[PDB]
Amino acid sequence: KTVVVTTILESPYVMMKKNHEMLEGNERYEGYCVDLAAEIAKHCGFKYKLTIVGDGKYGARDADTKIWNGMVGELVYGKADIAIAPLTITLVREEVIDFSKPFMSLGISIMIKKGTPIESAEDLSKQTEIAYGTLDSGSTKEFFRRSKIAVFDKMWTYMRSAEPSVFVRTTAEGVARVRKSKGKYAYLLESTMNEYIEQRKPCDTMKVGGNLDSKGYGIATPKGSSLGNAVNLAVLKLNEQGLLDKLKNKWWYDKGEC
Ligand SMILES: Cc1onc(O)c1C[C@H](N)C(=O)O
Ligand SMILES: [Zn+2]
């Protein structure tokens, strides 16, 4: 009956409202994905319940365990009916779950502390004083692990062996590390997140260089779900009406602190 939506606490997609302890259910959250979930549900005609993914991950398959974690896992093992989050459409994920056409276009980018002498991925690969890493259990880490292009392969070789670990559990952890490391740590994350953080106080970070790739976020459902068709049509309809652009402007720039 009520559609269980799995999502992740990642600003500005899903965040706890200031007054959340005094609110119930869906009303406890706010953000781009909260606004989008309400719209997808209206257009598809279903009631839903937002739930935060238990392990706080996007989703990756464990080598040997072979078990999918994160939001992807919630869909794969039937714990959730749909995932509405900044979840990247990738080949390994699409082999186990279905994705709508993209609701947001983005690419991996570099985040630096203002003043850091780095202008590109090539710059990072060619040096060692400035450490750099990515988020764990996601599409960004897999991009570097599977890349056959020289610069990225060199970056992966360094990242996989760096000590202490250059990988972080959450985006907020990556941003804090950039902010606290005096220019000695750069963070590789999706352009969407980079652009968002660039507009938040203390306004000390910035996106440098172009995107390393081009991809998109999709609304995900278990393979063969009855919801897939309507959800994809809803995403296409909402993008064409300008809603997705209005939502990005609202959560990224209208509320910008810089
Ligand atoms: C958001 C975000 O920003 N940088 C990232 O790697 C991610 C996670 C990425 N969207 C995923 O699906 O794994
Ligand atoms: Zn609508």
Specify the DSSP class assigned to residue 2.
P
Provide CATH code, domain 107-215: 3.40.190.10
What is the position in ligand 1's atom list of the atom closest to the CA of 87?
Answer: 12
Measured from the alpha carbon of residue 239, the closest ligand is 2
In Å, how far from its chain's centre is CA 207? 16
**Method used experimentally:** X-ray
Q: Taking phi first (over 0 means left), then psi (-120 to 50 degrees means alpha), and beta for anything else, what does residue 31 get?
A: left
Q: What is the resolution of this structure in A?
A: 1.7
Question: Rounded to the nearest whole angstrom, what is the distance from the C-alpha of residue 216 to the centroid of ligand 2?
Answer: 21
| Residue from 130, 134, 133, 128 nearest 117 by CA | 130
> Where in the chain are all domains bearing CATH 3.40.190.10?
1-106+216-255, 107-215
Measured from the alpha carbon of residue 83, the closest ligand is 1
162 contacts: CB under 8 Å, gap ≥ 6: 131, 133
Q: Which fold has domain 1-106+216-255?
A: D-Maltodextrin-Binding Protein; domain 2 (3.40.190)
The answer to whether 130 touches 186, Cβ cutoff 8 Å, is yes
191 CB near ligand 1 (under 6 Å): no
